[PDB]
Design a protein around this ligand. Structure first.
Ligand SMILES: [K+]
Ligand SMILES: [K+]
Ligand SMILES: [K+]
Ligand SMILES: [Mg+2]
Ligand SMILES: [Mg+2]
Ligand SMILES: [Mg+2]
Ligand SMILES: [Mg+2]
Ligand SMILES: [Mg+2]
Ligand SMILES: [Mg+2]
Ligand SMILES: [Mg+2]
Ligand SMILES: [Mg+2]
Ligand SMILES: [Mg+2]
Lengths: 524, 66, 177, 52, 67
RNA sequence: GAAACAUCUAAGUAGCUAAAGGAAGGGAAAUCAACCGAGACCCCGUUAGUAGCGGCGAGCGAGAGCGGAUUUGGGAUUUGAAGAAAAAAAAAAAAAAUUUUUUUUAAAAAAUUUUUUUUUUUAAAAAAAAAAAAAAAAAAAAAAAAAAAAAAAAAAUUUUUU
RNA sequence: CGAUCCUUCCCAGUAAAACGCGGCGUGUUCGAAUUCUGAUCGCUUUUACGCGAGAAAGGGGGACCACCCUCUAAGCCUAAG
């Protein structure tokens, strides 16, 4: 069985640095050099720098002389990664090596320059392609029109189509479609119809993408009944129904006002044949979440992972959450939370916070606690790559409820986790102080006040009163005097009723001198 | 201390050619190196000796075997 | 003391200060040796960083101290060079000779040792010359021949040798005549 | 607001590196020192810990 | 290039003064060889009697000085 | 000087010599501490005439820490890894107080402006064909540095450029 | 003009050791350490270079050994005081 040579040379390059003692091992491992071996190494290279290093070393070491297909392969990957000067400098060096120039190397260079938006240099190469002495017939003009109308050069593309049709060139459906898309994009209706009657006079029957061109042009001209007239015209012309055409029919319906009509054409989607494509499910959701219809959202959200499909943009998963929660159906949001964590997506703090905020606002407190615990046991807050953070309203009422009507411990655990990312809200701290005071552990209120003192959070006067009386109720007047000293050093004078309470509690416990030290500051 | 060298011909007590052997540094530096009877055991010269001996002894084996 | 700067001044004055960009100046600052060599004869040989040392000689019973020196083990030798096909007469320390043994010859030592470690302007010159000749050799190839061609070319060389000998003797006897 | 936390560039530069080891890690059967030196790592750690 | 210009003449080389090194041909010394520069395009195989060399057996020189 | 003197001191001082710069040098830990921690380099104060070295004589004499001045780090160096078997979900059934088990599974993103020529239409606003610029991303080199008028050249004194 | 990478560096005759001095450096000898398609075990694949697991390198901390702590040498540049 054993191992091939392309994969082991790629494991050389992937694991070790490119040194001369690695090159010696590669040279002694290769038993006979051929372009088949070079091509199988070059395709299977894990990184472009490994590929470029191998292609340079094999031609500079005298082991082989490279051919047209290897040169084409190098330019294709260098231009897909957009190492523009790299590919240009390789391309210019070929007639000295002896292999001829072909237009195949030039057209991928056109596409490579235009992918980065340096399309003026693509046109510059195109004008000198005939100067250099290579045939410039069909596919070169096709790629030039593909790249200049992506930037939107309709007034140029007219002139270069004139220079196309002047030099004995017969344009076809690909040319006409690639120019009609750009002319519809650049808002040129008369130019689109002129170049449609041009392909009428040339005499070639339009196809599915050609009829897609006019309907997406009418979608971007916001005329949808006319697009429906075109959509029955394509049925009356006997061409097969395309899933892309149905997708842009849904898009043109939901572009302005008709949001129920997307479901109405999904009822006819059975006739086309291929219902579950990604783009329909990607675009259909935000229109109906903008409208506010829910039963036609939850069923297709059930059908999302029924055939394992994902949207193009994933913020619709948040927009449907906020729309469905504001609609009011709570029991099916537990399908959304498990739709998040099962496709590929890690769940986020804001995603859990919206649902905890709804269960908190509508009398579902134990369910809010359940979502709270599965949020905090999964350490979602402390994740660096997650972007959406927990809203202030996702913890501001639930800290109040937890401290006032029950346990304070997991409330302080959640909020101490929130300090470690972004929160220093005083409201939850004050509520944690009162909750820890009235639970029966005033040491926690005192330490949270120490946290406030070191973090610089502004400290109130009424917070220390509950701490003092909590110390009072459990029989620790020395701790009460310590808290009183901290209150005075913070800068709040208490009232003589509290002074009279603490002085008598200190005196009756035999602590005369602490009471006298209270007397000193009340004299002062 | 001893050195590694690669024989280019047949030396009577050292061995046959194409073989790495261990010699004294004063032997190699003053006798075998200027007379091209041995080369240092580094990678460039080992590769050179191996390939040139392969090309010539291909003819030699083609003559001797048949 | 500031040997790198005094060598860089001479190199700049040789090559022209306009010729060098600031990045090339920054790169050239890290190739010129900045070592401590004071003795005159170490600038004319391959010493591999050995120098003289001056210290104390201490008596056994009295402990009396008087000045003395330790000198490097300098020997004058001829080392064989592969690309020059001939010997080079040098004054090497045995430390440098042992480093040459580890590297695989004087040429391989000059190729392997970087510019800062050459310690000497003549060391820079010799490393440059050996590198230029090896780059010249790096673009050549030899072609070998079949034994029938061996025999044919041997016979041709015999014919040309005997014809040249005959013509030379004839020319000598006619010039005598 | 970029000078509020100017250590975050170093933190997310060395975040993948900092998990491997304190001073270095084993890679392909040989020890390899860490990308960030120990004194600078301690500076970055102090800058992280001073804000909670 | 800087070190070549700094140590070059005041105002290819594998001939005249030193000629072809013996090392190149070390795996097999008694074999007639033709040195030639490597060309980017494939070269010709025509070899005259003047372009073929063999160190006889006489050679299995002078000596430079370091300073 | 050691009340003589030889290890020691005077002292790496005086002197001689070489090279570089307006400063030079040193510099971001294979550094200190002690199970707690500090955080590059140089200069000033204290520790302290203390620890240590020494015919343990005469004498020589720290480091760390702490208080000041300046306050600075940068580079290699970061990486997206460009889109039969296990894990997980949709529908049906059963049970417990949500949980457990089985059964079937090119385009629908690609954004712009000026000038010249000829037209339609009510100077407004749009039809066609021609030239370009939304490249200084990176650096060097060159010419020319803002309104109006006088002079030189070219073209037909006048106009344009300088 | 043209999206700008195409190499001073291959890096151990180094760290340490013996003898002689000394401003922790130096003269004469000598001389290491973990990978150079990483390896080993286990698993399916049923006949992988996939998946998991274990141990693997040096310097210093007043001879030396063990444990622990701390740092990553064998030429990168750098303002002010
Ligand atoms: K006296
Ligand atoms: K006396
Ligand atoms: K400096
Ligand atoms: Mg005296
Ligand atoms: Mg002294
Ligand atoms: Mg002096
Ligand atoms: Mg000066
Ligand atoms: Mg300075
Ligand atoms: Mg620690
Ligand atoms: Mg300080
Ligand atoms: Mg120790
Ligand atoms: Mg100790």
């Amino acid at each position: 069985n054993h191992e091939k040579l392309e994969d082991t040379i790629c494991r050389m390059m992937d694991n070790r640095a490119w040194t001369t003692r690695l090159q010696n091992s590669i040279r002694d491992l290769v038993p006979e050099w051929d372009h088949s071996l070079v091509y199988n190494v070059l395709h299977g290279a894990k990184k472009l720098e490994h590929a470029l290093q191998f292609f340079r070393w094999t031609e500079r070491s005298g082991l082989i002389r490279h051919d047209r297909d290897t040169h084409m392969k190098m330019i294709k990957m260098l231009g897909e990664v957009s190492k523009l000067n790299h590919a240009r400098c390789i391309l210019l060096d070929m007639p000295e090596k002896g292999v001829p120039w072909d237009e195949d190397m030039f057209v991928v260079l056109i596409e490579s320059y235009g992918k980065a938006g340096i399309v003026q240099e693509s046109v510059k190469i195109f004008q000198k392609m005939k100067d250099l002495g290579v045939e410039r017939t069909i596919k070169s003009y096709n790629s030039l029109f593909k790249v200049i109308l992506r930037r939107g050069r309709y007034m140029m593309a007219k002139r270069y189509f004139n220079k196309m049709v002047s030099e004995g060139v017969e344009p076809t459906r690909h040319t006409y479609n690639l120019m009609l898309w750009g002319f519809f994009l650049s808002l040129r209706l008369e130019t689109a119809l002129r170049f449609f009657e041009d392909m009428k006079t040339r005499g070639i029957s339009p196809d599915d993408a050609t009829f897609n061109t006019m309907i997406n042009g009418f979608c971007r001209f916001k005329k949808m009944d006319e697009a429906e007239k075109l959509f029955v015209e394509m049925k009356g012309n006997k061409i097969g129904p395309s899933v892309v055409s149905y997708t842009t029919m849904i898009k043109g319906y939901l572009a302005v006002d008709r949001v129920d009509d997307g479901l109405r054409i999904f009822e006819e989607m059975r006739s086309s044949g291929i219902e579950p494509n990604a783009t329909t499910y990607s675009t259909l959701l935000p229109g109906l979440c903008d409208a506010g219809k829910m039963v036609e959202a939850k069923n297709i959200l059930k059908n999302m992972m029924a055939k394992h499909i994902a949207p193009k943009d994933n913020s619709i998963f948040l927009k449907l959450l906020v729309s469905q929660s504001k609609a009011g159906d709570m029991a099916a949001a537990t399908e959304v939370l498990k739709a998040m964590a099962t496709l590929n997506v890690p769940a986020e703090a804001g995603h859990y916070g919206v649902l905890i905020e709804n269960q908190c606002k509508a009398s579902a407190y134990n369910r809010a606690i359940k979502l709270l615990d599965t949020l905090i046991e999964k350490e979602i807050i402390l994740r660096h790559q997650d972007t959406l953070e927990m809203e202030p309203s996702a913890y501001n009422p639930i800290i109040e409820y937890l401290c006032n009507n029950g346990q304070t411990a997991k409330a302080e655990v959640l909020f101490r986790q929130l300090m470690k990312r972004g929160v220093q809200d005083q409201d939850a701290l004050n509520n944690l102080i009162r909750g820890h005071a009235k639970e029966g552990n005033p040491d926690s209120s005192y330490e949270i006040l120490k946290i406030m003192s070191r973090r610089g959070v502004p400290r109130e006067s009424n917070a220390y009163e509950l701490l003092i009386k909590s110390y009072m109720s459990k029989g620790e007047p020395g701790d009460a005097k310590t808290a009183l000293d901290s209150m005075v050093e913070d800068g709040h004078v208490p009232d003589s009723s509290l002074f009279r309470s603490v002085i008598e509690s200190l005196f009756e416990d035999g602590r005369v001198q602490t009471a006298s030290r209270v007397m000193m500051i009340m004299i002062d | 201390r001893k050195l590694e060298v690669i024989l280019t011909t047949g030396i009577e007590k050292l061995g046959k050619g194409g073989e790495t052997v261990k010699v004294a540094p004063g032997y190699f530096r003053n006798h075998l190196m200027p007379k091209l009877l041995a080369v240092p055991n580094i990678d460039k010269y080992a590769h050179l000796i191996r390939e040139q001996r392969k090309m010539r002894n291909y003819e030699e084996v083609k003559e001797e075997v048949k | 003391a500031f040997r790198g700067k005094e060598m860089m001044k001479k190199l700049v004055k040789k090559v022209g200060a306009e010729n060098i960009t600031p990045e090339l100046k920054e790169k050239l600052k890290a190739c010129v040796p900045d070592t401590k060599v004071v003795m005159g004869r170490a600038k004319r040989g391959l010493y591999a960083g050995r120098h003289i040392q001056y210290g104390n000689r201490v008596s056994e019973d009295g402990g009396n101290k008087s000045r003395r020196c330790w000198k490097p083990n300098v020997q004058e030798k001829r080392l064989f060079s592969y690309i020059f096909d001939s010997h080079i007469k040098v004054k090497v320390t045995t430390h440098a000779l042992r480093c040459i043994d580890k590297a695989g010859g004087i040429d391989e030592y000059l190729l392997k040792t970087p510019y800062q470690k050459m310690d000497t302007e003549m060391g820079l010159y010799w490393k440059t010359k050996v590198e230029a000749r090896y780059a010249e050799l790096g673009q050549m190839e030899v072609a070998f021949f079949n034994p029938e061609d061996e025999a044919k070319l041997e016979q041709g060389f015999k014919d040309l040798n005997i014809a040249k000998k005959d013509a030379r003797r004839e020319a000598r006897r006619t010039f005598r005549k | 607001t970029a000078v509020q936390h100017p250590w975050r560039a170093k933190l997310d530069k060395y975040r993948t590196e900092l998990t491997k080891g304190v001073w270095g890690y084993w890679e392909m059967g040989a020890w390899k020192p860490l990308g960030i030196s120990a004194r600078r790592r301690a500076m970055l750690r102090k800058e992280v810990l001073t804000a909670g | 290039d800087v070190f070549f210009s700094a140590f070059s003449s005041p105002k290819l080389a594998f001939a005249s003064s030193f000629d072809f090194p013996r090392i190149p041909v070390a795996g097999v010394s008694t074999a007639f060889f033709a040195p030639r520069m490597r060309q980017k395009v494939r070269g010709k195989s025509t070899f005259s009697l003047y372009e073929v060399q063999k160190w006889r057996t006489h050679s299995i020189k002078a000596g430079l000085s370091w300073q």
